Amino acid sequence: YEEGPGKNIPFSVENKWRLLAMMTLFFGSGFAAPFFIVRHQLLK
Amino acid sequence: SVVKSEDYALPSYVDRRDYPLPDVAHVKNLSASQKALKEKEKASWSSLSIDEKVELYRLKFKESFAEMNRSTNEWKTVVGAAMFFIGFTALLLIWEKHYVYGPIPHTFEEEWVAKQTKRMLDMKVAPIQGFSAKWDYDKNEWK
Amino acid sequence: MAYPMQLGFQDATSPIMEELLHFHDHTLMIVFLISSLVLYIISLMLTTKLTHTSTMDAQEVETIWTILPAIILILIALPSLRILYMMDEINNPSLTVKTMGHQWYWSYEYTDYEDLSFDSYMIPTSELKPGELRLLEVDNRVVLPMEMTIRMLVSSEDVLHSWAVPSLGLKTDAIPGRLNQTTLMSSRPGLYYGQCSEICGSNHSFMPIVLELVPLKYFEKWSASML
Amino acid sequence: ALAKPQMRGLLARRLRFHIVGAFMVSLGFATFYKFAVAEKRKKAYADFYRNYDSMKDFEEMRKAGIFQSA
Amino acid sequence: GARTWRFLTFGLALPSVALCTLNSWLHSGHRERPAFIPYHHLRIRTKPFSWGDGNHTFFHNPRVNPLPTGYE
Amino acid sequence: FENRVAEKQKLFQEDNGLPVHLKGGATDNILYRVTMTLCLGGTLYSLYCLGWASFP
Amino acid sequence: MFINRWLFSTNHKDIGTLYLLFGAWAGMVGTALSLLIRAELGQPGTLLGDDQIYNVVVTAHAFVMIFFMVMPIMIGGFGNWLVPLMIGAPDMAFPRMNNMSFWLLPPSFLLLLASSMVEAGAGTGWTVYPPLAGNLAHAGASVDLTIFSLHLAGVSSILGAINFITTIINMKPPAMSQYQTPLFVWSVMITAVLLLLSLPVLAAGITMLLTDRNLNTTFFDPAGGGDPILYQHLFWFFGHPEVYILILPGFGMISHIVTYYSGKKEPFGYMGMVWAMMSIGFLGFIVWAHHMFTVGMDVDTRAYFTSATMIIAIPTGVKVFSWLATLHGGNIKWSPAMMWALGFIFLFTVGGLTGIVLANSSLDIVLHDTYYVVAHFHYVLSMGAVFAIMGGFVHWFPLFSGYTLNDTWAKIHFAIMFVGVNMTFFPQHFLGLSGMPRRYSDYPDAYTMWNTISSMGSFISLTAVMLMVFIIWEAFASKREVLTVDLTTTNLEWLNGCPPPYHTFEEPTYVNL
Amino acid sequence: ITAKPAKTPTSPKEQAIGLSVTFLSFLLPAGWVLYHLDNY
Amino acid sequence: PSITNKRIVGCICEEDNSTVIWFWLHKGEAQRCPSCGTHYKLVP
Amino acid sequence: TDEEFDARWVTYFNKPDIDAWELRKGMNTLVGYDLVPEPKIIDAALRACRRLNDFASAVRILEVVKDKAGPHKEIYPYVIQELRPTLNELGISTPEELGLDK
Amino acid sequence: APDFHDKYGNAVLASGATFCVAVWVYMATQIGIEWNPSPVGRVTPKEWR
Ligand code: HEA
Ligand code: HEA
Ligand SMILES: CCCCC/C=C/C/C=C/C/C=C/C/C=C\CCCC(=O)O[C@H](COC(=O)CCCCCCCCCCCCCCCCC)COP(=O)(O)OCCN
Ligand SMILES: CCCCCC/C=C\CCCCCCCCCC(=O)O[C@H](COC(=O)CCCCCCCCCCCCCCC)COP(=O)(O)OC[C@@H](O)CO
Ligand SMILES: CCCCCCCCCCO[C@@H]1O[C@H](CO)[C@@H](O[C@H]2O[C@H](CO)[C@@H](O)[C@H](O)[C@H]2O)[C@H](O)[C@H]1O
Ligand SMILES: CCCCCCCCCCO[C@@H]1O[C@H](CO)[C@@H](O[C@H]2O[C@H](CO)[C@@H](O)[C@H](O)[C@H]2O)[C@H](O)[C@H]1O
Ligand SMILES: CCCCCCCCCCO[C@@H]1O[C@H](CO)[C@@H](O[C@H]2O[C@H](CO)[C@@H](O)[C@H](O)[C@H]2O)[C@H](O)[C@H]1O
Ligand SMILES: C[C@H](CCC(=O)O)[C@H]1CC[C@H]2[C@@H]3[C@H](O)C[C@@H]4C[C@H](O)CC[C@]4(C)[C@H]3C[C@H](O)[C@]12C
Ligand SMILES: C[C@H](CCC(=O)O)[C@H]1CC[C@H]2[C@@H]3[C@H](O)C[C@@H]4C[C@H](O)CC[C@]4(C)[C@H]3C[C@H](O)[C@]12C
Ligand code: CUA
Ligand SMILES: [Ca+2]
Ligand SMILES: [Cu+2]
Ligand SMILES: [Mg+2]
Ligand SMILES: [Zn+2]
């Protein structure tokens, strides 16, 4: 297995813009979820 | 002096006021002139020039106490930036008020509040300290 | 009831609530002093270039750190437990009233003499009369005699509720299959408000309590008129 | 020539001075709080009730139209 | 080890004793003695005791221990 | 019965780089594939069941 | 290789990393729930709906912040990363069981999000009291999905506790006694003992609730001779230890951070710190009925629970004073981590002291089920547990990643979060004293000013959370590699470099007697 | 701690892009839901 | 003893110290504990 | 007692064959105490620097005396005054004389 | 060599303070937020019955 900075993680940091997209999707999905659950409950 | 990742397990150089004499010299490799200066250091220090004494200090150490201990302007950036982001937060609250928050209940209308205030004074809400205590029932005005 | 920008407790309407205000004053002075001392000591530890980084002996100072807090806790516990046992003292009530929690309203039963019972529901916001309080008024108030020891018994016919009147120092959980007792004594006539204080579903926010405290003669005539 | 200054126990000296200062201040706050909050509260309740007429209070409330029962 | 049992002695056991000593020393006051009732199942005398006047128990306390005929 | 532990010690110590859950041979791979297929397929079915149960 | 490494891990560091990622994601969910709460409360009148959707949000907020953010970060994340490194161990005792503690959490979280999607949600409070949580007042699958969520989280933590206790007892260097392990290691051992004893009682109680809901048992149903109050005793027998489980690893991290940034080789009064944590752990089991002062228990029982609860202030004060004594004479480094730790000492003390106010059963009559309780627990959780997490994250990020944060951005982050959490929770004391109840979607008009300011606070905290994501991005984007770390002689977890190799302590440390 | 200079420096402009994208990733989806609450 | 050319030492400088002092011991001349000065020598 | 502490430290630095490791260990240990070292201790450490042909460490010792005094600005000038005969004898320039106070 | 704080700190502190005050004053006063202050010394009580 790869050792050292940027290699001991399950996500790539080879490209900072690809990483920004991945982090955006990751943290953004968690933050969005409750808003969409509330919407779902209100639409029943 | 170039510090390398692969030297992690070896004694290293630090500037710390609580560790004045670190484990290694700042500069280990010596030029011809620097070797001659370290030989000169074995004789009377009275014979060293001011420049030679400074050069010997700067081989042993990176920064002086005065340099390592200096104050910075970082506090201005931190406080200014914090106030900027707190300011940005008020934009989110303006957006929420405009697009999310509908009209408040009718019980906050000026006339409702005036009538509710009189009814609270008529039932003597908090007459010892909190509310009615602040009304002058003799003069019909706030104390 | 609470008023805008209120910082502390509702003014006391019962002697026990008075006792609780003075006990809170005593406790809060201690909370302020300890908070302030910790903040000050932090600021003192952080404002000197002088250093001392060698091993420091702990046992002498730990005596102070344990004994002084132990004394402070005793100085809180003594008046705390005096009040706890004062509320538990035998009193001899003149009247027993029952309240039953429901989803989402209170019923009241005054059955010492006659079968008097009724339901008490929040006045909807759209039906408030000018000067009335949003979410606090009810259609049928809990009329009670002032300056008299009343036994309140509290239960539920469905889920948990809790019957609270902050200005009298009251909060008694409403548990199905259980009859919980508290005592109520108002020093004053008037209207005293509270709100359901255990999560009970869709209209937990909307099942308030309004006591109406009047002279015994008025209470007797109201009682007769409600049969 | 400069006189010999105190060179030992400077941190300990500073701590002793400020911990005593903090005790002295704590005592002044306890006295101020006694006066400004605790005694003020005791006096507000004692003064309110000293000549309080519950029937007069009720009559005022009744005449203002507050009650369901009166 | 010894260090662990010393730690338990001073950090748990003796603090417990101190707390129970504080608790007892708070409820140490003398209780109001109960009315004397000459119950036949109490103050048993089938034979005189082998000390004093034969009618006093060994750790007789005049304040709280009545004789068969009542409080002294 | 006879003690065949030494024969299993030889099999499981063979220097073949296999992780212990596959080192018994082809039967281990089959049982692994059955287990992981039931787990992943059941998980997808549990998500379908949520989708269904999320609406009246 | 990716599957073998990240789905089939037997490595304490990678498993720690999985926990930190999980906890970070959970924190965003919990923050969004907190903002929905404060969006509703920030103006009088109804925004979202009646109390059902509101209390589904409140319930989920608590379960997410506790079970999915704090415990996974402190115990799964910092515990898995740091405990083996701090004792020189090559991994955990049960490195494959460790992986199952992690992988039980995504399914647990899925069951909680399923609970909120089906029917009308579980609008119960995180305490899940019957009969509101029963099959009449909460008919359908939501509460059963919540119970199963808690079962999977409980098994995760029970197996994790077995792993930590065994590792810490059994895998130290043979010369190292328990009294030569770092305070963070003690804090995890004690937390693990609390988990081992408390979670099975929760499991019994929520199993009884499940059978009342589905198998016609009546543990909590008076019609069958049951008692709703029995559920409360079983829940809180777990629940009070649970709050000590949430803070103890924080206390261990604060001891390391204050020592480190004071330039000290050691915390003040090590054995007193050990004594304090074991005393807090023990006393935490004998106080649970301070959550039940209004249910109708006997006066002598109320007097006991008041007194036993207050006793916890003594060992806790020893820790606070010992932190201050660790600062004393320090060469203070005003790092971002140190700022989190100093914020912790002060704000935790304030919340502990409002807990002492609540311990008084007579005053708790008026404060119970009010915002005073909400103010108390957010000082200790949102300014205590969270400040210890942020201090430990910024302190150890370079160990875990091999990269540095921007210290100026991290100080900005701290400043914004400090303002936001104080603006959010300080005014809730006033709401509590003046009688605003818990779990209300709407409030009488008098309570408007403090609810408005509190909600404005919550938006400042959201700004801090968004900035934290950016700050982590900027560190990975810039790739400033670590060169040297000070004080490795008293911080073993740093001595194998940044990040440490996959396998550390393949050759153990040499420690003689 | 000491560290190397950044291997892939992030300029002020790049930081403004990262900070902007990060904030929008939190704000736009919640904003859309809260804007449409009346419709739900 | 070591199977390589460096090993971590922890020095419990005095009996019952709670603080362990950690450092890499390298092949070559004996090194000293930076707290108590105790000598250690690697035997690879 | 103060005199016994000072005498132990003078003896430590006065050891003729003190090595570089011992010089560093001594100074790094001494600065952990709640005191600015007495001139007689600093004198012995500066003479150890001379036996070890280490001019730079002698200057660094003077800097850490100043640092240990914190806000007590009177201590360092007093210590330099008391050391002037030793500084003159060994040709040790103060940090101030070298510009290393900037 | 002046660092970021030497070059920009004064401008960051002045602009951040000015922006923060302006936007919070606007938010607090100009967009109809209901603060519900105390009626004490502010509201003239009016007949309600
Ligand atoms: C850990 C526990 C925790 C935390 C942190 C919080 C944080 C917050 N909580 Fe609370 N809350 C509870 C646990 C917590 N809460 C519980 C148990 C209840 C009672 C539930 C019930 O009544 O049943 C409750 C209830 C509760 C109420 C009362 C609701 C009511 O009675 O109707 C309110 C009201 O404002 C509130 C608001 C908030 C806000 C604004 C925050 C904010 O301060 C949050 C701000 C965001 C953060 C603090 C960051 C989070 C993320 C991380 C730390 C991840 C970091 C990433 C890495 C390290 C990589 N919460
Ligand atoms: C990390 C979380 C955490 C921690 C550590 C604590 C710690 C304490 N808590 Fe709290 N608590 C909660 C989280 C926490 N709590 C939660 C979530 C709830 C609500 C549950 C729900 O209903 O949903 C709650 C509820 C709760 C109640 C129930 C109130 C009610 O519902 O009516 C009480 C009652 O006694 C209590 C008390 C305490 C006490 C005495 C401490 C003590 O451990 C504090 C001790 C600390 C100090 C005292 C400060 C430092 C000490 C000094 C500086 C020494 C000098 C001090 C003195 C002499 C006093 N808390
Ligand atoms: C303080 C901590 C405890 C101290 C223990 C006791 C102290 C004194 C006596 C010592 C021996 C005790 C052993 C048990 C015997 C019987 C009674 C002892 C219990 C005692 O002391 O009881 C007292 C009575 O003693 C009495 O009668 C008289 C007691 C004296 C005469 C005892 C004679 C009987 C001996 C029997 C011997 C049998 C041995 C068995 C051997 C077995 C081998 C096969 C109680 O006082 P009281 O006033 O009634 O009530 C209190 C009112 N305020
Ligand atoms: C309503 C339905 C909800 C139910 C959800 C059920 C939850 C999860 C499904 C469980 C799947 C279990 C699969 C078997 C796990 C075996 C674990 C085991 O046996 O772990 C052992 C360690 O724990 C030990 O010993 C001692 C501990 C062994 C514990 C084993 C299994 C526990 C399962 C449930 C426990 C809950 C307890 C109930 C009381 C609250 C081995 O450790 P490893 O790291 O593997 O190896 C280490 C190597 O050196 C071995 O050579
Ligand atoms: C509402 C909560 C608010 C939180 C406020 C956060 C404020 C952040 C301040 C950052 O400002 C800097 O702080 C450094 C430390 O981080 C200072 O170091 C200087 O001063 C220190 C003395 O304490 C020395 O240790 C240093 O060597 C020295 O450079 C530096 O000059 C200063 O610009
Ligand atoms: C490796 C991948 C893992 C395999 C996944 C397999 C998923 C496919 C299962 C088939 O689905 C079934 O459909 C039935 C519809 O016929 C349902 O019947 C149930 O629902 C019926 C509704 O008509 C009722 O009659 C009865 O309750 C009952 O038969 C039953 O619930 C459901 O499971
Ligand atoms: C608590 C967390 C959230 C705090 C507040 C977040 C701040 C909001 C950020 C902006 O969110 C956006 O706001 C737009 C309006 O400003 C919406 O456009 C809406 O309105 C536009 C203008 O009327 C239309 O063009 C669009 O179609 C329509 O969706 C858009 O969807 C939404 O993403
Ligand atoms: C004996 C034990 C361990 C000592 C050691 O082996 O190093 C020490 C560690 C912490 C100590 C305790 C803590 O310092 C807290 C208390 C302090 C008081 O001054 C004495 C009782 C007190 C409860 C202490 C008793 C005892 O000295 C303890 C329990
Ligand atoms: C023949 C066989 C020898 C085992 C061996 O040494 O390999 C014997 C030894 C002990 C026997 C077992 C024990 O005697 C106990 C059981 C006795 C029952 O009568 C038959 C089954 C039973 C479970 C036996 C089966 C079998 O005959 C065993 C297993
Ligand atoms: Cu009834 Cu809440
Ligand atoms: Ca609202
Ligand atoms: Cu508790
Ligand atoms: Mg309750
Ligand atoms: Zn040593």
Residues 6+ away with beta carbon under 8 Å from J91: B44, B45, B46, B47, B48
Report residue B56 as tokens: 């010997």
Q: Which residues pair with I6 in a beta bridge?
A: I26
User: Could G484 and B107 be called an inter-chain contact, meaning their C-beta atoms sit closer than 8 Å?
Assistant: no
What number of other Cβ atoms are within 10 A of residue G349's Cβ?
23
Q: How far is the CA of C205 from the centre of ligand 10 (A)?
A: 7
Tell me whether residue C132 is exposed, middle or buried, using C-beta atoms within 10 angstroms of its C-beta: 0 to 12, 13 to 18, 19 or more: middle
Cβ–Cβ < 8 Å for E57, E65? yes
- Ligand 5 contacts (CB < 6 A) are B 69-75, 78; G 332, 334, 411, 415, 418-419
* Strand-strand pairing, C142-145 and C208-214: parallel
Length of chain G: 513
Q: Which residues does A28 contact at the CB level (< 8 Å), separation at least 6?
A: H25, H26, H29
In our burial notation (b when 16+ CB lie closer than 10 A, e otherwise), range J73-93 reads eebbebbbebbeebbeebbbb
Number of domains in chain B: 1
3 state DSSP class of C100: strand
Contact partners for chain A, using 3 or more CB pairs closer than 8 A, are F, G, H
Q: How far is CA G342 from CA G259, G320, G323, G417, G422, in A?
A: 12, 11, 9, 14, 15
Is the CB of residue G99 less than 8 Å from the CB of residue G15? yes
- Per the DSSP assignment, residues forming a β-bridge with G318 are none
CATH superfamily, domain G2-513, is Cytochrome c oxidase-like, subunit I domain (1.20.210.10)
Q: How crowded is residue J2: how many other Cβ atoms within 10 Å of its Cβ?
A: 11
Phi-psi domain of G225 (left: phi exceeds 0; alpha: psi -120 through 50; beta: other): left
Task: Name residue C201's amino acid.
Answer: G
Q: How many domains does chain C have?
A: 2
Q: Is K3 helix (H, G, I), strand (E, B) or coil?
A: coil
Amino acid at C47: T
> Is G348:G323 a contact under the CB 8 Å cutoff?
no
* Contact call for K39 and C4, based on CB within 8 A: yes
Q: Which DSSP symbol is given to J92? A: P
CB contact under 8 A, B9 and G497: yes
Whether residue C37 is found in the same domain as residue C104? no
Instruction: Check: CB of residue J31 under 8 Å from CB of residue B18.
Output: yes
| Nearest C-alpha neighbor of G441 from the set G27, G51, G6 | G51
Residue F13 CA neighbour count, 13 Å, CB half: 6
Alpha-carbon gap, residue G59 to B50, rounded angstroms? 73
**Is there a single domain that holds both residue C129 and residue C223?**
yes
Closest CA to D57 of B136, B122, C185: B122
Q: Tell me if residue G267 falls in helix, strand or coil.
A: coil
Closest CA to G251 of G345, G328, G351: G345
Tokens matching residue G329:
């004479």
Amino acid at E14: L
Q: Say how far apart CA B89 and CA B86 lie, in whole Å.
A: 5
Query: Does G503 participate in catalysis according to the annotation?
Result: no
D35 and chain C in contact, CB less than 8 A: no
Both C124 and C167 in one domain: the answer is yes
Nearest to B91 by CA among G464, K20, A27: K20
Put simply, the answer to whether B86 touches G445 (Cβ < 8 Å) is no
Q: Is G70 in the pocket of ligand 1 (CB under 6 A)?
A: yes
Domains of chain D: 1-70 (4.10.93.10)
What's the number of domains chain H is made of?
A: 1
Q: Does the beta-carbon distance from B57 to J56 stay under 8 Å? A: yes
- Residues of the domain holding B35: 1-143
Between CA K15 and CA K9 the distance in angstroms is 10
| Residues around the ion ligand 14 (C-beta < 5 A) | I 11, 13, 21, 33, 35-36, 38
Resolution (A): 1.7
Instruction: Find which of A14, A19, A31 to mutate to test the H interface (most H CBs within 10 Å of its CB).
Output: A31
Which residue in H2, H27, H37 is closest to B3 by CB distance? H2
Q: How far apart are CA G195 and CA C62, in angstroms?
A: 29
Tell me if G173 CB under 6 Å of ligand 1: no
In total, the C-beta contacts within 8 angstroms joining chain B to chain G are 78
Task: List alpha helices for chain J, DSSP H.
Answer: 2-14, 20-30, 39-51, 55-68, 75-90
Residues of D with CB under 8 A from a CB of J: 1-12
Q: Sheet containing C180-184: which strands, arranged edge to edge?
A: C116-120, C105-110, C95-102, C150-156, C180-184
- Counting ligands in written order, the one closest to the CA of G445 is 11
Sequence ranges of the domains in chain E:
1-72
Please give the DSSP secondary-structure letter assigned to residue D30: H
- C95-102 and C105-110 strand pairing: antiparallel
Contact G83, G168 (CB under 8 A): yes
- The chain K residue lying nearest G408, using CA atoms, is K5
Residue ranges covered by each domain of chain J: 1-102
User: Beta strand pairing status for C95-102 and C150-156?
Assistant: parallel
For an interface test with C, the pick among B107, B109, B142 (most C C-beta atoms closer than 10 Å) comes out as: B107
Distances (CA, A) of J24 to I35, J29, J41: 12, 8, 14
- Contact between H34 and B97 under an 8 Å Cβ cutoff? The reply is no
- In the block, residue with structure tokens 């402070």: C72
I39 labelled as ligand-binding? no
Scanning C3-32 for CB atoms below 8 A from K yields 3-5
- Establish whether residue G370 lines the binding site of ligand 1, counting it when its CB lies within 6 angstroms of any ligand atom: no
The ligand whose atoms approach the alpha carbon of E16 most closely is 8
F38 φ/ψ angles, rounded to the nearest 5 degrees = -65, -45
Q: Which atom of ligand 7 is nearest to the CA of G39?
A: 1
The alpha carbon torsion through G364, G426, G410, G18 (nearest 10 deg) reads 30
* Distance from residue G266's CA to the centre of ligand 2 (Å): 28
| Residues in contact with G281: Cβ distance below 8 Å, sequence separation at least 6, in sequence order | G190, G193, G194, G241, G244, G248
Extract long-range pairs of D37-42: CB within 8 Å, 24+ residues apart.
D37/C25, D37/C28, D37/C29, D38/C22, D38/C25, D38/C26, D38/C29, D41/B129, D41/C21, D41/C22, D41/C25, D42/C22
- Where along chain A do its domains lie? 1-44
Atom of ligand 2 nearest to the CA of G127: 23
The DSSP 8-state label assigned to residue G93 in this structure reads S
Domain boundaries, chain G: 2-513
G447 catalytic per annotation: no
| Test the D interface: residue of B117, B122, B125 with most D CBs within 10 Å | B122
Cα–Cα dist I40/I22, whole Å = 12
Q: How far is A24 from chain H (nearest CA, A)?
A: 6
Answer whether E24's CB lies under 8 Å from E16's CB: no
Distance between B25 CA and the closest CA of chain G, angstroms: 15
Give the ligand 6 atom nearest the CA of F38. 1
- Chain-centre distance for alpha carbon C138: 19
CA G62 – CA G68 distance, rounded (Å): 10
Please tell me which residue in G19, G186, G231, G244 is annotated as part of the active site. G244
Residue G403 has what DSSP assignment?
B
Could you count the other beta carbons within 10 Å of the beta carbon of residue B71?
Answer: 6
Domain residue limits, chain F: 1-56
Q: Name the method of structure determination.
A: X-ray
CA distances from G452 to B98, G13, G43, G401 (A): 15, 44, 6, 40
Q: CB-based contacts of G215: which residues, under 8 Å, 6+ apart?
A: none
Considering the domain architecture, whether residues C122 and C84 belong to the same structural domain is answered as no
